[PDB]
Structure formats: C-alpha cells, structure tokens
Amino acid sequence: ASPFRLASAGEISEVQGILRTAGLLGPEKRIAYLGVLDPARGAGSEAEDRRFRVFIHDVSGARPQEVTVSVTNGTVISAVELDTAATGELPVLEEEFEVVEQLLATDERWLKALAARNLDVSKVRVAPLSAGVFEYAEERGRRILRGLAFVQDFPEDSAWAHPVDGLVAYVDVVSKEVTRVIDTGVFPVPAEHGNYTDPELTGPLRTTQKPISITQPEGPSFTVTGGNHIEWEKWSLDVGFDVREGVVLHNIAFRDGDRLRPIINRASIAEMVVPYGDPSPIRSWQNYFDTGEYLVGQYANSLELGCDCLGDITYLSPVISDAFGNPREIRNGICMHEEDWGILAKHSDLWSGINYTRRNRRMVISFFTTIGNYDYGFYWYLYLDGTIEFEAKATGVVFTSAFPEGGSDNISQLAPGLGAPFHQHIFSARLDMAIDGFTNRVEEEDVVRQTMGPGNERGNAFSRKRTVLTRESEAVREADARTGRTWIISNPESKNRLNEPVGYKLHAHNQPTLLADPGSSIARRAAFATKDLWVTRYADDERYPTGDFVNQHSGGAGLPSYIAQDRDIDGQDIVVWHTFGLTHFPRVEDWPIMPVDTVGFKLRPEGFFDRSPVLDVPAN
Amino acid sequence: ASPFRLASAGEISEVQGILRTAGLLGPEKRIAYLGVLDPARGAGSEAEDRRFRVFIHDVSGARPQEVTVSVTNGTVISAVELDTAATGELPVLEEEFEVVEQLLATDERWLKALAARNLDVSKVRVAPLSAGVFEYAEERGRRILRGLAFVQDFPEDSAWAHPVDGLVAYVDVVSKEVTRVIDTGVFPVPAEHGNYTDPELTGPLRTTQKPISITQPEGPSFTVTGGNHIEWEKWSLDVGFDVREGVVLHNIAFRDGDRLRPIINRASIAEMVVPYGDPSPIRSWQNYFDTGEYLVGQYANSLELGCDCLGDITYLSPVISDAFGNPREIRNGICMHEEDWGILAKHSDLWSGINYTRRNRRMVISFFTTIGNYDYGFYWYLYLDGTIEFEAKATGVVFTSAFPEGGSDNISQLAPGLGAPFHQHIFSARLDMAIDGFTNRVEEEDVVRQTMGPGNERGNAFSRKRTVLTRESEAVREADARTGRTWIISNPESKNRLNEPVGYKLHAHNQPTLLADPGSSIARRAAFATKDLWVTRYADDERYPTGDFVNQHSGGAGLPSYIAQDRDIDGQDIVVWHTFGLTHFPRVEDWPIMPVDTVGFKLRPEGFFDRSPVLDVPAN
Numbered sequence A, B: 001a002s003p004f005r006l007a008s009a010g011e012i013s014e015v016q017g018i019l020r021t022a023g024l025l026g027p028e029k030r031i032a033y034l035g036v037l038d039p040a041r042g043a044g045s046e047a048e049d050r051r052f053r054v055f056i057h058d059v060s061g062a063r064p065q066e067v068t069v070s071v072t073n074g075t076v077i078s079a080v081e082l083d084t085a086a087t088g089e090l091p092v093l094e095e096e097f098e099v100v101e102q103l104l105a106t107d108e109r110w111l112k113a114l115a116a117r118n119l120d121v122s123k124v125r126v127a128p129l130s131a132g133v134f135e136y137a138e139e140r141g142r143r144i145l146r147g148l149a150f151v152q153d154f155p156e157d158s159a160w161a162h163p164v165d166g167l168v169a170y171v172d173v174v175s176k177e178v179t180r181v182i183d184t185g186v187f188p189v190p191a192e193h194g195n196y197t198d199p200e201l202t203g204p205l206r207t208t209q210k211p212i213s214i215t216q217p218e219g220p221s222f223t224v225t226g227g228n229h230i231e232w233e234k235w236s237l238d239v240g241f242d243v244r245e246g247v248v249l250h251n252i253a254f255r256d257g258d259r260l261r262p263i264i265n266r267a268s269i270a271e272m273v274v275p276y277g278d279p280s281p282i283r284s285w286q287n288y289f290d291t292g293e294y295l296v297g298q299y300a301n302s303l304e305l306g307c308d309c310l311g312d313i314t315y316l317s318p319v320i321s322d323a324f325g326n327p328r329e330i331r332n333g334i335c336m337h338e339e340d341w342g343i344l345a346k347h348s349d350l351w352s353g354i355n356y357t358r359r360n361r362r363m364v365i366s367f368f369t370t371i372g373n374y375d376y377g378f379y380w381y382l383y384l385d386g387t388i389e390f391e392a393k394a395t396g397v398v399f400t401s402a403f404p405e406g407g408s409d410n411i412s413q414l415a416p417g418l419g420a421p422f423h424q425h426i427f428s429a430r431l432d433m434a435i436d437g438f439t440n441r442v443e444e445e446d447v448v449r450q451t452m453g454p455g456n457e458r459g460n461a462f463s464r465k466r467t468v469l470t471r472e473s474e475a476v477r478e479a480d481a482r483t484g485r486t487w488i489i490s491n492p493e494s495k496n497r498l499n500e501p502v503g504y505k506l507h508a509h510n511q512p513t514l515l516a517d518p519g520s521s522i523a524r525r526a527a528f529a530t531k532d533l534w535v536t537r538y539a540d541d542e543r544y545p546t547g548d549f550v551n552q553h554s555g556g557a558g559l560p561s562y563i564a565q566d567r568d569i570d571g572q573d574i575v576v577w578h579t580f581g582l583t584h585f586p587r588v589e590d591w592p593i594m595p596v597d598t599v600g601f602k603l604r605p606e607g608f609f610d611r612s613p614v615l616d617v618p619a620n
C-alpha cells in the first residue's frame, strides 16, 4: 500500500501495454530509461497515483520522446518530442555497445590501422565510450560513441593488459557510420598478460587463511515489511531502486521515544563523473558520467552469499525494464545486513567504581555495479548513535594506455610498456533534507582562532563561528580542512530541551574537487564537481546536478542554472548537494586488478537529541 | 631469545634488587617510570644486553635520579641526579592523586569556599591535574598539582555531572602545602545527575538487538611465538609494551616471496596532548600530556571477552613496575584478533566472462586506557594489501564546568546549567621508518593543476609534483587538503621491477592542528602539535616529541631542539613524526557518556611491490 514500494514486474508490464496501445512503442522504439516518480509534496490525501517516467529512443532517427504514464489509471499523462541538439541526447543503450566494434570491423580506415600493427581484427575488442561535446560540428544532434581498442589474445584473456594506443574512432550509432578514424602513430602493444586467475601469475594460493564465521542464531535485528520498508534499532526508512541512480533511501526517520522524527526525505548518489587527465588526443575527450550517461542501476551485480555479502543477509531483487519494456529482475541485487562495529561507549570511573562498556553496530545497505573495466560498490550505513554514512568502494581494472618512452607527466607506469592515465572519480550526493520536518537551513561552521590578549591572557582560547546561508546565490561553498569547516543542517522551528535548534552536522573528507581547467568542456558539463557543497530550494523537476539528459549535452544545465533563481533557503524545503571524490594516480599495486579504495561522507546529530540516544543499549 | 620480548616479572624483580643493593631504592624513593631500552643500531652481534631505564622520585625532597640498569649483568650502568627546575619534573605518580583531595580537606581556605556553597567536604571529589608552567615563580622546581572540584551525591554517583565552578587550588605534593586557593565567585552546582546506568535515565533497555556471533572454527590465522612475535598473512612484527607509550610495534616487515622486507622499525604514539580552550582563569592552565605526564600504559584496562574484544581473541598480559619496583601484571591488557573487512577486489569482465571476488581482512592490535574522565582506545591495523593504519577512539565522560548565564563563546551547554569547555585531543605518531632497509627519504606530493593551452588544448590535464626533503630545517611540513598533499617515504637504493624507488604513502586526515596562540605556554610546550609532519635523523636519545621530562617543563625541548641540528635526511636513517587530532566542540549527544569518535592515519604501499600483493588470496 505504500507509495514508496519498489516497482513490480506487473507495473512494468502495464507500462509496456499502455505505451504500445498509445502507438509509442513500435518496433523502431527503445526504452532508454524507465523509473517510478516519487510522490509530489503534500501526498497526505492518500490519492495514490503510481506514475512512471520513460525516455523513448527511435533507432530510425526520429525524434525521441519523454513520456509520463499512470499505471493506476492506465493512461499517458504527457508525451513530449525532444530536440536533442538543444536539451541533450538520451542515455547510452546497452545494445549500442556492440554496434561500435561491429561497425569498425568493416571500416577500411580501421582495418588499415590494425593491419599496420599486425593485429587480427577478430582479436581486437573496442571499448565503447561516451563522446562528450568538443570541436566536431558534425556531431551536434547525432548519437556518437567513441571507441578505444584493446587486444584479447584468447577468449579468457584480460584485454585491458593490451591497449592499442595512438588510435581512436568516432561512430554514429544511429546512421551506422564511422565518422572519423584518428591514427597518431604506432605504439607497441604491451605484451605481458594481466590474467589474475592464471596460476603462473598468482603463484600457489595461500593456505594460511582460517575461516571467519559470522552468524545470527536468532536472525537479524531488522524487519522488512511491504517489500522494502526497514525498521532497525529505532531507524525507519524505505529502500528504493532506480535504474539511473541505483539504491535510493526514502523517509529516513528515527524513533525518539514516542515520536517518529524525520531526518532525510530522500538520499541518493545523483551523478558520478570520471574525468581523465591525459592530454593525448587519443584520450583527452574521455569523461564518464556513469550515472547520467550509462545508468549505474542497470549494471548492478547479482551478489553472492559468502563472497560479496557475508553474514545473515537479506536480499532485495529489484525489477527494471529492458529496452523493449519487458520486466527484468536483478536477482539478489541489494544486500542488507547488520554488522558489529566495535565499542560504542566506555568508561571506567575511579570515584563511582562503575565500569561500563557498550558495543556499536551498523545497518548496511549496498549494491555493486560494473561499467566496463570499473566496478563500484555503494554502501549506506546507519549507526546506533544516529550517524548516517555513505561509502563508495572503487575496484576493478584500471583503464590503460601505452607508457611512452621517455615517460609522462600524466600517466603512471604499471608494467613494461603499460601505462594508466591519471583520473578522478567524483560523486554527487543529493540529500533532500527533512530535519524534524521540512523547514531547514544550512550553516557553515568554522573554527575561530583567538589572539592572546585581554580576555585571553594565556592565549589558550579558541571558538567557532556559524554563518547562515540565506539565498541560493550564496550557497555554493568550498571545503576548508585547515579551519575544520563543516556544515550544519538545522530546523529553526524545532528546538531541543536546551532551547537550541535541532541539527545534523555534515563531515566531509575534504578531498580535491574537479582539477580540469575551468574553461574546459568537462568543467562546464560537470560544474557541480567544482565545488564541495551546494544548497538549493526543493523543486520537483530539479533531480540531477547535471540535468536530465547528460549525454552529449553542451553544458550549463543542472546546478548552475538552478541556483540562478536565487531562492530563499533560510528555513525552507531545501536540498543539499555534496561533491566528493577520489583523485587516482595509479600505483603498481593497482595492477592487474585493483584493491578497493574508498571515499564518502557522514552526518552526525548535533543537538538533535536531548542527550545521548544510546543510553538504552543493553550490556550484551 | 628475542631482544624485543616483553619485560618479564623476573626482570623487573631483578631491577628492584639491583637498585636496592646499590642504595638507590630506600623507603623514601618511588619509581615514576621503568621500561626496557630498545637495542642500539647494529645489534647483529647477538651480544644481548637487556637494559632498563628508571626514573626515581624522592618523597623527602631530595633530587630525583635517572638510572640505567643491565639485568643481564646485574649492574647499574649509570645514575644521574636531575635538576628539575632545568630539565623538567618526573611524571605524576598514581599515589600523588589522592594526596590532593586529602590536603585540601584540611585547608581553611578550601573549607571556607565549600562552606559558602553549602557543600559537604566529604562529598567533594577533587580532580588532580597537571600544572604546566605559567606565571607563578614559586612553582619553579616544585612538584605542583592543580585541583578542580566535583560533587558526588552518593558513592555510585557520577561526580562529573556536578562541577564546582569558580574554584581552583594549587598543591605542592612533596612539601604537602596548599600554595594557592583561588575563588572567583559562586556558580550554582548543576543539579541533574548523569548516571548512565540509572533506569530513570536510560528508560527500559532495548529488547530488539539479536546476537551477532563471530567465531573461528579452526582458530585464528595468526601465530604468536616467543610471547610477542606475530606472523599473519605475510606480515611479521613484535608487539611491545611500555608504561609511557603503551603498545609499541617493532620490526614491521612483509614476506614478499622469499624476502622478508622491512617497512617500519618502530611505531608508537609518542605523545598526546589535550589542551582546553576556555579562557576562564579556573581552567585556562588546563592541558593534559596523557603520555608524557601521566603515562598511558600504566592505566591500561583489563579487556573483557565479548564486551571489549569480540571474536576469537588472543590476549597479552604485559608486566609493569609499581612505584616500589614490584612487578604488576595488566591481565588481558592487549587484544589481538583478525576481522573480516569486506571486499578486497572485484571485477566482472564482459569480454573474458570471468567473475572475480576476493574478501579483505585485517589484523587488530589494541588496548584501552582510562585517565580520569576520559577513556582512549589505541588500535593498530594490518591489512592484506599492505596497508597499515592507526586509529584512536575517544570516549568516556566529557570534562564539565558551569554554563554561564548569558552563554559562552568557549563552552557548550549539555544540560541545565552544565557546560563542557572546548578542547582538542592531539596525538603524535613516531614512525622510525625502514622501507626496505634504513636508507630512506621523504617526498612531499602535491596535485598540480594545469592551464588550458598548448599541449593541453582541451584543458583536461592534471599532474603531480614531488619535493624531496633533504635537511631537517626544511622538514617541518603542513597539510594541504585542497592540493591532495601526501608524503612518500621511499628507499632510493631499492627499486621495483620498473626501476622506480620503492615507497609507502602517508595519508593524513587533515584535521586542524593546535589552535592556541603561538605565544602561549602550551604552544611552546607542545610545539610538535603546531605542524602536521616532522622528519628527523634517527638518534638513540630522541625518543619523544616533547622531551624526556614533560611535567612542568618550561618549553622548547623535543622536536624544535632536535631539528635545529639540521641533519641530512636524504637517504638516511630517518624518523617521521605525524601530528593528528580531534577538535571537540561537545554536543548534547556526548552527555552523559560520550559515543566513540575517531581519528587516525594510514600508510599504503606506493610501488613497494611489483604488482598487487594479494593475487594469491583464495576464493574463500
């Protein structure tokens, strides 16, 4: 009955039927995106209407469409033709990936380039990459992918070990034309293999690791109701899944005595960009918007018990649409479990004689996605003490190139002749805040150093200052680790027992933001990534920091255009957008498969409760 | 047989006998510090000599002594009388703590102050705190403690809830004289209790938490030999224990094929300071050097199975000396165990068809100490992939004051009338490096942004720069989170298979350093805490960043005096000193007992290995 329930296979089948009957899903059409729309603000009328948003691509070159459907009523609500030269192309389709390699295999220029390198075309894999927007006027309004080549010596070989540098091609995937083949010169193809399951590379496997057995003899402490509603240790939330964003958390609330207190209305990773920092023309266009261009949810892994998720695991299997509107289940795509998390609180008191220890735990909600060579884990954590944390885990195989003789300022060497270009992995968390309700504000908190003198005669005092962000034009903020800068989201109309506004503090990791020149194409298309924190006034249609149609969009859409409205955010329905990421200079230890590295953020209560919220945790 | 073995009870008993026979341990003497000396450089002669360093206090006012003893030979090696007005006082003795409250109970000024507040002297606990060095000329060369008062309503009451503000006393603990009683005015004593085991405060305990059972059916994967030598998943190290520093790690090495490769010769937390930022004269002198003044090892907790350490736990019970030279065992003072640590590496490859997942784990070595109201956990972690990490966990009860009517810029309000002064908790990690041997150097690595233009026509390139620190005078460095600053410790004479020097990268958390005015007493005594990174040339006698005798030492000793030697550190035997800490603005949720907060650092391999070191981890 809950409006936040996961999409069912029956809903998706109904959407397909509604589109087909309306004449919108002929044999030339493909569904590039399908997802449920969240309820609009003020849904306290119970008048549920399950609506789906659909992007429809046409493989014959006709204009694509954006369509909204009500499965409750069985009707098309609206259908708009899209001018993609203006508003951006649709996300890349899984079926377009294979088109690139097949088209290049019959192009005379491509074959001549491979022949010069004595490579068998049957052994050459082509990575199909998003194109971005650069200097090529003929690409405006066309669906382009760019291809980079790797050699696979045999069917089980890791092609990433054998990049074909000096060569790139551009492909129009609708007209099925190779527009350009660029050959800047022959580089040796690195010859060492990177097969991390080959015994010749691994050596004998270790026999020293003894089992760690994690079990829950009475079952887990959380309950799942209505398919996706979780209650755990005073937390309450709904676990959503969207094919673009992946796991989405709704209605995060905490049961404080007899009050269910809201904290976050919607939390998601709303974009993630991977920009490459190699100025070679073979790769200087390379920027992945994994969320906006590729849709990270549709490549979610099925997670295996004992290997991917260890312990007493509860799975969710979300349903998405394939390109024809058929429902597809991602079996065991989301893992949920609780974990011991060390000591929560401890004190041995000399005067009272009381020794006190309590243990912490966290609830984990995670999924893993694979986009070509990279694999990303998305982890949401809820702690007993009210802390909320996100962590991204980056692994997989690094993207490779030749390593030039005489070295490089922009590429690491991993093996003889094998390079890995510098790059970043940058995420945008969209936090639609609801601290004790929807009237919220953001304050920036800095440490304040004080000078020795009157009133501070021993020169020991220090303080802090808080600055309220009152309008969107002043709500674009940068980190300052040296001054301990954090941001507090508070509710000025809801006070704790000390008559202070209740709040939550955002703690960032203070990693570098986007490094590209501010005049670059990527800085314009990924403007969100140039600043650590943005605050906007909530609006139904302001969903992504990069806009709705990211693929081949010329720039400026999303957050820079939203904040130009300069709306009041002082005690209003607000959304916090936090940029955070990893700057990756690959090391030898990242090859041939990369150990996990992590980045994230957390929010901790700041006078939200009237005292510690974990006094009622038992001794265990 | 190993020279790095823990001190035995028999060794300590022999030290006592040697001191007694030499006439150095009469009834007026107290042992303020006793610990084993590490082998000197070049101990490859097997000529083992177990030597102990002893600080001997005299309760009659005679000069204290520093003594070195050889238990192997049964001799006093050297004995030096100390001029404490010059070189500092000895660490505080546990037995001096009770002297303060007892002496004040008979002082007419103290009793008049308590009578004005209608407090029963039998209910007034006095926190005995280190004195530092301020404006009081009569304290030079005397052993002073300062006392702050708290009311205990009944024997099991938490006195911290009832600070007696406006009152402080200074006590000469040798002459047993109260030198000064300062009463700046009557503040109401906060009346709410803070008894976190009282059902009236906790409410009914939760019944919702189901058990998490962590077991190892075949036992743990590590072995312990010689009492304290650990081998685990290619790591090798010795776990030491010192009464001042606590757990010390020796001879950290990694088995790479058939070579045992050193990484760190000695790792320890060599100082930790807690400066308070309240300018009230009642507290503006308040700075704890928990390591140098109090000795954190002697207050180590006995850790309980299932509560403090969960899983298959191996304990060490270190032995220390009491004040009379008798051995005292800290039963179950160190916990050692391995922990599952999520996913290590993962890739699902479209082209090869191979799906690959491996799980990570870490070895944990920890102890917990209690100093008055605060409790600190010290955690060392070793990971499968070569990462080394330290984490401090801060909990206990925050130090309190009155909350002034009309508020404060330097104190948080926790409850009606109850304040908590702002403060920091700052640690110094001393890392005596040995990356593939002792010829090491430090490079500072910054991200480099590049301008769009020739050679970078699309404005996407970025790079990095490394600066070698060649002399101690240029080796005092500050963090810069915005430029992604890290430090690399490398061995220029040991190269990986790509002909690059092997190295390890230090990743800091980039938290604020010491906030006090640079002209303050604490900035002079804790100079190490004003900068994030120091590099010195190894020397036997340069052990602590604050010097040997921290208590009431006027300042300048330790790191600032060491680096004035301006020694060569470019490919030499070097020591890295890393400052890191927490800046604590207490929140309501920290009261009445504080949930754990954490800070730390980590070191990751940087071309130390020829490829990923965890290819031989099995599928599990």
Ligand SMILES: [Cu+2]
Residues within 6 Å of the ligand: A394, A398, A423, A424, A425, A584
């Ligand atoms: Cu990367």
Ligand SMILES: [Cu+2]
Residues within 6 Å of the ligand: B394, B398, B423, B424, B425, B584
């Ligand atoms: Cu603190």
Ligand code: NA
Residues within 6 Å of the ligand: A085, A086, A087, A088, A553, A554, A555
């Ligand atoms: Na446009």
Ligand code: NA
Residues within 6 Å of the ligand: A265, A432, A433, A434, A438, A538, A572, A573, A574, A575
């Ligand atoms: Na909001």
Ligand code: NA
Residues within 6 Å of the ligand: B085, B086, B087, B088, B553, B554, B555
């Ligand atoms: Na002095």
Ligand code: NA
Residues within 6 Å of the ligand: B265, B432, B433, B434, B438, B538, B572, B573, B574, B575
């Ligand atoms: Na060294």
